[PDB]
Every structure is written in C-alpha cells, then in structure tokens.
A paper describes a structure:
Endolysins are hydrolytic enzymes that specifically recognize the host cell-wall and cleave the peptidoglycan to digest the bacterial cell-wall for release of phage progeny during the lytic cycle, which is why they hold promise for the treatment of multidrug-resistant bacterial infections as an alternative to antibiotics. Our finding provides structural and functional evidence that [name]-[name] belongs to a unique two-component multimeric endolysin encoded by a single gene.
Fortunately, we obtained diffractive crystals of selenium-labeled protein in different crystallization conditions, which were then optimized and diffracted well in the space group P1211 with cell parameters a = 47.03 Å, b = 56.92 Å, c = 91.52 Å, α = γ = 90.00°, β = 96.29°. The crystal structure of WT [name]-[name] refined to 1.75 Å resolution revealed that WT [name]-[name] possesses a CHAP domain (residues 1–143) and a CBD (residues 168–237), which are connected by a linker (residues 144–167). In addition to the full-length [name]-[name], three additional CBD fragments were successfully built into the final model. The four CBDs together form a tetrameric ring 45 Å in length and 45 Å in width. Electron density of the calcium ion is clearly identified in the crystal structure, and the calcium ion is coordinated by the conserved residues D20, D22, W24, G26, D31 and one water molecule.
Author numbering:
A (entry chain C): 1 to 25, 27, 27A, 28 to 119, 121, 121A, 122 to 143, 168 to 237
B (entry chain A), C (entry chain D), D (entry chain B): 168 to 237
The structure:
Amino acid sequence: MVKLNDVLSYVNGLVGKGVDADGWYGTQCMDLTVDVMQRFFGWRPYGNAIALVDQPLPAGFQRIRTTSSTQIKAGDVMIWGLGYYAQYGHTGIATEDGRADGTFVSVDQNWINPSLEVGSPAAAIHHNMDGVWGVIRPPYEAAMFIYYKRTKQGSTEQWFVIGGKRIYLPTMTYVNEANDLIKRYGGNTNVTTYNHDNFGLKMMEAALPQVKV
Amino acid sequence: MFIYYKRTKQGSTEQWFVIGGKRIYLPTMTYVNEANDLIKRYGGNTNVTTYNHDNFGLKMMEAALPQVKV
Amino acid sequence: MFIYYKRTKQGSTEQWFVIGGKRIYLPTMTYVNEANDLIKRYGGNTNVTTYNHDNFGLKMMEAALPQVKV
Amino acid sequence: MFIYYKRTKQGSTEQWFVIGGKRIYLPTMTYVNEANDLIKRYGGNTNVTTYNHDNFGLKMMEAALPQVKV
Ligand SMILES: [Ca+2]
C-alpha cells in the first residue's frame, strides 16, 4: 500500500513547476490534488476544491473537520472552505505535521501569484488556519470496480461493476461489501466520478446492463 | 473464476463456482475438484470466502451472475 | 477492455472498443478520448492492432462480442 | 481468452476457443492460428489441455459459456 515518503518526495519535487490535470485554466489548486491523488491512489476527486468537503471518498480515506493545526498530518489533502474560500475553495498537500503555533506547511498551486487564467506553479507555503475547513487523510502504510455518477439532479451515486453488469449501491453497507469483493477477488480500486452526460459513462451504461439488489 | 461457500438459511454449507460470468452450484466433491483444476489451469482466484445467505456481497454476486445447472 | 482498428470494405479505418464482452464503434474523436481514458483507469489492454474486415480473428471477435450503440 | 481440446464421444479431437464469455469451435487451422494470435495480443492464457467429452470440468465450461458460430 501507499508509502507517505513516496508522496512527499513527488510533491516536494513539483515545487517550482505546475501540473494541469484537466486542461482548463493551467495549473489551478485542484489540479495538484487531483494529480497526486490519481497517480498514487487511483482516485480522481471531482469538482472544485470546495467539493472536497462533502463528495464521497474511496475506501480507506478519512475526512476530518479541523479546529487546530495540530490535527494536520503530513500527506493530508488540505481543504479551505470558510469565509472567502466558501465559494470555490482551495487545496494543496500538507508536507509536514501541523505545528503547535497554529501553522502548517503545504505545497499548493495558485496560492502565490494567483491567476484565474493560467494558475501558478506549486510552492511550499507556511500557512495559518484562516479559512481552513479540514483534511482528507489518504490511507498511507504504517499509520470488478466502483465508479461514481453525478446525476442531473445534483447527487452523487455509487455504482458497482461486476460480472459484466452494473449495480447501484443504495447504502454505505452496500459500498463496504462491494469494496470487500474488490479486495478478495482482485478488482480495480480506481474511483472516478462521471457526469451523467459523459460519453465514457454512456458507453459503460450501454455495455453493462443494470441489475438490482 | 473462483469458488465461494454459502451458508444457506437452513444452515447447510454449499460450494459455488463462478465462471464465465455465471454461478454453478457444485453438487459433489468430484465437481469441486474439477472446478479447482480449472482455477489452477486458467489463472483463477484461489480465495475461498464463506458468505451467509443474507450477506450483501453475496446478494450482489447472485444478482449479477446468473445460475447455470451442470 | 481494449481498442482495435478495423480497415473496412469501403477503405476507411474505424476505431472499436471492447468492454463488458461487447463492442462499441467509436465514430469520433470524442468517443476515442473517452475510451482511452477508460483503458487507463481500469487496466485495459493497450495493444492496438489493425484488422482487415475479412480477417478471421476479427470475425471471431465480432461473433463473440455483440455490438452495442452509443 | 484460451483454447482447449475436446475429445468427442465418436473419437475425434475438436479445438475450441474461449473469448468474451463464449466458446467457438475452430473449424480449420487458419481459425486456430488467428485464435492463437488473439491470445498473444491480448494476454490470454496459453494453457492447452485436452478434455474427454465426459469430463465434469468440460461440462461446467460448456454450460457456462454459450457457443457462438464461426
Ligand atoms: Ca487546469
């Protein structure tokens, strides 16, 4: 399973460069988080940064509202969602545990010299807790697949592909059991969200009949 | 390809064989042996898990993988 | 899951996607991009081979893998 | 994706190709060679085993994998 040092090496290596994960508006803040999460965990977070507050998370991930910097651990995905940040959010990756004086260090894009059009390169930033909502804590070492669908009406459904079929997962216990199947039988642990009008999703939905549980 | 065990409502333990997107109940140890040889030949999964009849993982496999009779 | 190309009777080269024991014709760039992304996500096979429309390997694939639209 | 041989009740040997959850009788060597080429391209299993017609492993495959023609 994923080693924290691998993530931190990679993240610290990006400092001074930028990654564009989506092909819009150059190197925005979410681009970094999405790049790292996709390469290391096979998870593509959905939406703007602020959508990290409440979108579903893959197996093993935890989300914590943080009152204090001392709750921040190295390799946490930081979420800003309060105040100015309530509209779009901000994100970046914690490269160190949070400090006792109310500060922390994260590598973020589009923080220094921000740009709506082209974003800005990754930088290592000594932050305070102003606007911080919390963290997503990925499952690091020592401390058949599912996909998500964003519906026309603005909900996120989880779906399970198995035996050439697709199953809508109605509850989190269904989710947990499908993840257990994945684990046992060597399914794929990738998690991506598709908008209801995405052609990838349309092909999947046409090829894999729905069955009910 | 894999085998699993099902605890039925009536408390018997059944062996089932998943192959080709289908489920086959294995009625005798000769069938079970032949299923395991198939697993070995064709790179199937050797995990054996026991599922209670009300387990939602079981329910999702039964819904998605039609039964065929040998 | 994989993509293959088919050189048709009328001389065009078509992209086709195999997923779920089915095949999907990928008529435009937009389809092709999305299919390639599925391959990367879900550990599809990245062999790309071109088949002439009368190739028997192709014929077997077409008999075994029904076509589904959109 | 794999090939197996079947020795029939009347004593001839048939080559069969498993693909897409289906099975295809391979009527000539050209079909055989193209099936082998599919296996190599798409990381199919290269096990080649002969089954007598009465074998229970073969009967399970034959029940789970419908035949398609070519
Ligand atoms: Ca971008």
